Design a protein around this ligand. Structure first.
Ligand SMILES: *[C@@H]1O[C@H](CO)[C@@H](O[C@@H]2O[C@H](CO)[C@@H](O)[C@H](O)[C@H]2NC(C)=O)[C@H](O)[C@H]1NC(C)=O
Ligand SMILES: *[C@@H]1O[C@H](CO)[C@@H](O)[C@H](O)[C@H]1NC(C)=O
Ligand SMILES: *[C@@H]1O[C@H](CO)[C@@H](O)[C@H](O)[C@H]1NC(C)=O
Ligand SMILES: *[C@@H]1O[C@H](CO)[C@@H](O)[C@H](O)[C@H]1NC(C)=O
Lengths: 48, 40, 48
């Protein structure tokens, strides 16, 4: 049905970037850390 | 009826809903060629 | 937009074929076309 589209973009930024992981461990989550998407609220009410 | 968004008081229909002192603009999108009945 | 309407026919309706002496011969179809290597498509009541 034609309705003038108003968009919403949900995007997530996984940045695993470990220090190779072949010398000691890859599944040890090194520099695994922040993976997040801009939509989080300080109150952090669920974003619908 | 007219092309301009204001048009006359290519057909563009805008439905705008305002709550309290805030005014918002909405998009009609599809416009029927002919409507024979209306229900609410 | 206007009022035209369109039907949605399925792509591949089942076809009825015949076999005799361990080889295929003849075929009941729906389209006025020679799908297989058969050289004639005799139109007949209720089917081709
Ligand atoms: C059905 O008829 C066709 C032609 O009317 C026959 O076709 C020949 O088949 C050979 C073997 O594949 C091909 O090398 C020729 O090029 C075909 N000729 C044409 C004109 O296509 C086919 O053999 C017949 N089959 C049966 C079971 O009757
Ligand atoms: C997420 O983490 C990466 C690396 O830890 C960092 O570059 C980025 O600034 C962080 N925040 C966001 C919103 O991507
Ligand atoms: C659409 O909303 C704007 C802003 O509130 C208003 O100026 C305009 O008159 C509205 N369009 C109508 C009522 O057709
Ligand atoms: C069926 O195909 C034959 C092949 O020549 C053609 O002459 C005839 O007009 C066609 N009939 C229909 C209804 O498509």
């Amino acid at each position: 049905l034609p309705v003038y589209h108003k968009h919403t973009f949900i995007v997530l930024y996984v940045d695993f970037k470990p220090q190779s992981g072949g010398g000691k461990c890859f599944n040890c989550y090194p520099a695994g850390v922040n993976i997040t998407l801009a939509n989080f609220n300080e109150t952090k009410g669920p974003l619908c | 009826n007219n092309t301009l968004v204001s048009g006359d008081a290519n057909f563009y229909c805008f439905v705008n809903t305002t709550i309290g002192n805030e005014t918002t603009s909405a998009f009609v999108g599809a416009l029927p060629k002919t409507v024979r009945e209306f229900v609410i | 937009t206007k009022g035209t309407i369109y039907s949605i026919t399925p792509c591949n309706p089942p076809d009825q074929l015949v076999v005799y002496q361990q080889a295929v011969v003849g075929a009941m179809l729906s389209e006025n076309f020679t799908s297989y290597g058969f050289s004639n498509v005799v139109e007949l009541p209720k089917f081709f």
